[PDB]
From a paper:
However, one distinctive member of the YkuD-type transpeptidase family, LdtF (recently renamed DpaA), carries out the opposite reaction of detaching Lpp from the peptidoglycan layer. Assays with purified peptidoglycan-Lpp as the substrate and chemically synthesized compounds suggest that DpaA’s shallow L-shaped active site can only accommodate and cleave the peptidoglycan-Lpp cross-link with a constrained conformation.
However, by treating purified sDpaA with V8 protease, we were able to obtain crystals of the V8-trimmed wild-type sDpaA. Subsequently, we collected a 2.9 Å resolution data set using synchrotron radiation. sDpaA forms a pseudosymmetric dimer in the crystal structure. The final model for both chains A and B in the asymmetric unit includes residues 36-229 and 36-224, respectively. Unlike other YkuD family members, DpaA is a compact protein of a single domain composed of a single mixed five-stranded β-sheet (β1-3 and β4-5), which is flanked by four α-helices and one pair of β-strands (β6-7). Unlike other YkuD-like transpeptidases, sDpaA’s second mixed β-sheet region (Val98-Ala145) is degenerated and instead consists of five coiled strands that are connected by only a few backbone hydrogen bonds. The catalytic Cys143 residue is located in a sharp elbow turn of the coils and is surrounded by three loops (L1–3). These loops create a shallow substrate-binding groove. By contrast, DpaA and CPases have a shortened L2 loop, resulting in an uncovered substrate-binding site.
Numbering used by the authors:
A (entry chain B): 36 to 85, 87 to 94, 96 to 105, 107 to 123, 125, 127, 131 to 185, 187 to 194, ...
B (entry chain A): 36 to 229
Amino acid sequence: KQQLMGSPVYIQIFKEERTLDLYVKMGEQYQLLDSYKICKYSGGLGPKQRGDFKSPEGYSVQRNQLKPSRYYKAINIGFPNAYDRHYYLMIHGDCVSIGCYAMTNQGIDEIFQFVTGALVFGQPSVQVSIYPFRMTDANMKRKYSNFKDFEQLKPGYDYFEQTRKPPTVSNGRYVVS
Amino acid sequence: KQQLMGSPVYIQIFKEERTLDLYVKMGEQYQLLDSYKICKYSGGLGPKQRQGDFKSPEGFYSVQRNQLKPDSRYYKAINIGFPNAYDRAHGYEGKYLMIHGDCVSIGCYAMTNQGIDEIFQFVTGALVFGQPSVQVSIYPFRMTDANMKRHKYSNFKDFWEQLKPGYDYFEQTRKPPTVSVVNGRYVVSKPLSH
């Protein structure tokens, strides 16, 4: 039973693996709640910059979950972030969109509830880590991409797999603790 | 389409009709969102008063973050917050009185799991965006003079006569009743001459 509603919560997206892992604060470390199949993204691998048809990589929420008219239960990633600002991108259910990440409707239901849950009870922001792929050096060496340097994200992926804590992130380049 | 999430919300329960109506603010007045079957309550008709009472409450209540999970027992419990101002004024005891999903309970209104899902999200929605309380009017039955007559000679005529004005205000204005306890009695406000 998820009697864990409204506890803080954190998300990791993996574009290539087409999945979203959703974790929940249990005492002093986040443990996997469930994880959900990404039906559609667009522009394949790489982050957003311009008419670009890419889905973003790199985000907090708060109350940008007001629905729009186009989408079902859209969670606004809040692009452009501080980094993006070098450039209505959403997580939502089965719909056809320009950039956004498209889940099953069952999946968004489950997600959206847990987020709003966490929000209701404290939880200033819910952070969301969007990666192009699982960042094991295996995949990382699978290089020579225009995006290779944007290696800025590995530390993030790494931090979490090691500590199970959302990374503390911030000159035109992401840095963590 | 439920693009109306996070709009203010109001609930009315009807014990006798075994249903919960859930309304949502559309501009100046609430419009029925959907309404849901109550699988199980207990003790049948009338408000809750002693611990042993197998009674489910009746009255006007507020919800805030009374969605803390005691899910230890129930699924998606919204605590009605009994005892209220009225209840306390008569020195009634209870706790843990709930609107919740398909679980087995003593003083609580039990919806289907599908039903509670829809409710609970709309509530948390509303509270996320402002909305200090969700008001929750729990009635023994739809309070038409027809029903009020079927139920003269009840111990609770007086009590229920205190609720009718609330039920009435809403079918009339489609705004949550401004209610308050005066001397152990609910009084339903209603504007003056201007």
